[PDB]
């Protein structure tokens, strides 16, 4: 590692001689191996880098089942390919086709990681609102219960003579 001495004595000083705070970085940040810049795209789509065989209609459950469907019949087709001529050239075309099938199924399912946070951040804080509420009518049930205490003490105030 390394020891720092350049600014350690800069900030143990008097007045504004310690350095002012840095401004908010509105540019590239160099933290770690990643960049983690501002306003980044959250995720890359399936459009780039992956050949697309499904249309835009996106029957999400049916895309799940058709990909399951097509893989199983292609695995049986590949078994027939290994039965007939496993030493063919057409194997790696078949291997990358099912690999193409396996890419599409995995990206579609993961969509509830930011979506799950919206329900749970809601649901506990009406309980504390309820706890704010169930203590609210606690307050009138307490404040008018001591006004009636004042009332009977004032009602008994002349009657005690």
């Amino acid at each position: 590692m390394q020891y720092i001495k350049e600014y350690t004595d800069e900030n143990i000083q008097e007045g504004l001689a310690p350095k002012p705070p840095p401004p908010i970085k509105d540019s590239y940040m160099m933290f770690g191996n990643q960049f983690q810049c501002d306003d980044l795209i959250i995720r890359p789509l399936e459009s780039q880098g992956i050949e697309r065989l499904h249309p835009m209609q996106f029957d999400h459950k049916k895309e799940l089942r058709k990909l399951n469907m097509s893989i199983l019949i292609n695995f049986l087709d590949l078994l027939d390919i290994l039965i007939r001529s496993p030493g063919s050239i057409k194997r790696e075309e078949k291997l990358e086709d099912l690999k193409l099938l396996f890419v599409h199924v995995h990206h579609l399912i993961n969509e509830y990681r930011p979506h799950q946070a919206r329900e749970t951040l809601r649901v506990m804080m009406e309980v504390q609102k309820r706890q704010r509420l169930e203590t609210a009518e606690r307050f009138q049930k307490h404040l008018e219960r001591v006004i009636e205490m004042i009332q009977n003490c004032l009602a008994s105030l002349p009657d005690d003579l």
Binding site: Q2, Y7, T8, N11, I12, P21
Partner: protein, 113 residues
């Protein structure tokens, strides 16, 4: 001179991130830098990451946790043994599993019902 501000910021950032490692402070201990008067003047100074403005560039919790132990100077005379540094390391990781152990019980509670 924008180079000095950024470079020092990330140099000093990793220093407390290096200080987040309990075995690194053990590496201070056999090096005997706990009693150095310049370093005790430096480590009292080093306590300025507690504000959230500097902590948005700070990423891990126990950097600030074990630095405050060093402030009392009672904790600094120990740690020459690696067993107490390991004990600090082991209990930190025995409680880093808190969210995991909390989530698995509620998952067990929902699976049991």
């Amino acid at each position: 001179d924008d180079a000095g501000n950024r470079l020092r910021f990330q140099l000093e950032l990793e220093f407390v991130q290096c200080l987040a490692n309990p075995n690194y402070l053990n590496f201070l201990a056999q090096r005997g830098y706990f009693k150095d008067k310049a370093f005790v003047n430096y480590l009292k100074y080093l306590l300025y990451w507690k504000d959230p403005e500097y902590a948005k560039y700070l990423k891990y919790p126990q950097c600030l946790h074990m630095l405050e132990l060093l402030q009392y100077e009672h904790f600094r005379k120990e740690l020459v043994n690696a067993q107490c540094a390991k004990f600090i390391d082991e209990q930190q990781i025995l409680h880093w599993q808190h969210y995991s152990r909390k989530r698995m019980r509620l998952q067990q509670a929902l699976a049991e019902q």
